[PDB]
Design a protein around this ligand. Sequence first.
Ligand SMILES: Nc1nc2c(ncn2[C@@H]2O[C@H](COP(=O)(O)OP(=O)(O)NP(=O)(O)O)[C@@H](O)[C@H]2O)c(=O)[nH]1
Ligand SMILES: [Mg+2]
Lengths: 134, 204
Amino acid sequence: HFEPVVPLPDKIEVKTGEEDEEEFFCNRAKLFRFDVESKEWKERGIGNVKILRHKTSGKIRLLMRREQVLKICANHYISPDMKLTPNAGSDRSFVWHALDYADELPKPEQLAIRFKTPEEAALFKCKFEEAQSI
Amino acid sequence: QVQFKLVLVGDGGTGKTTFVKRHLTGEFEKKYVATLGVEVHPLVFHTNRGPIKFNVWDTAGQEKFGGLRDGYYIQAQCAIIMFDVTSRVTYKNVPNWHRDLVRVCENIPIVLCGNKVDIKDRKVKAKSIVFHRKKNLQYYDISAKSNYNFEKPFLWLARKLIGDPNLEFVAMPALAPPEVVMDPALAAQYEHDLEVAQTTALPD
Ligand SMILES: Nc1nc2c(ncn2[C@@H]2O[C@H](COP(=O)(O)OP(=O)(O)NP(=O)(O)O)[C@@H](O)[C@H]2O)c(=O)[nH]1
Ligand SMILES: [Mg+2]
């Protein structure tokens, strides 16, 4: 037992910033951010990539979170400028550039997402683009 | 604002840095690059009683630093003592660190972590671990390579620090991002330079 140092913080209306949107798509995958600082590709996260369109505003974004700890690792809005190009023929993963906000600070990271199977990638591709068709 | 000083100590090679740099980037550093006498990065965890920030003093391991790692210790509020489990030596030294800690800042919550439990050829067997029992320290198997339990350490501490035995980590407010329009040359170029990337084989 250790006496607490900081005064007890009241509970919270545990948000989630989710809602007000609906899952236009949601599959788990692994995320990668490029380094440039070197040239190696880095593991950014593992969990569910979602595609949410606001109920009101109608603004579709791509929110990814990490399992276990649950932390955003993708947050940008899908744009018509973004083009999910394959990657070394890897029909299970794609790469696109995005002014992501996963850290709550805008950073123009080049990304890569890889899926367990191709069907899953294909579906992601479709739904992703279908979300641009709007 | 809720913040705590966390000093991560332990024989180099044990993964202390790889641990923290994963909770920070979600990246896994395969290569060894010794920490030159402490490095500090902050870690944030969103809980039911609000979010908390962990100021992590990722210290060095090579004894060549034995001196300075006392100032790193001043006013620390909790620490994670870590050892390799794949290198019994590390475990052997454990009791040493526990001392250095209780030297400058007595009591204080401390978690003992046996990292790398992802590797098959385990050497520091489960029943081998005992110090945590004799020293009354929360212990957990970790694996910065498989994220295995990698949150339990902080969670355990959080609770101790705050006072809510039931405090719990819970997702993370997915706040609204920034607005960036205009395609012109803008997105047209973003394309070219992107070639440089996808031309770099993907990890795994
Ligand atoms: N497979 C596996 N490798 C790990 C794990 N944790 C980290 N590593 C490996 O541990 C090696 C060295 O660990 P690192 O964090 O760099 O050292 P440290 O513990 O910080 N020592 P110091 O900072 O004192 O110099 C790296 O090559 C990294 O690949 C783990 O859970 N298992
Ligand atoms: Mg290191």
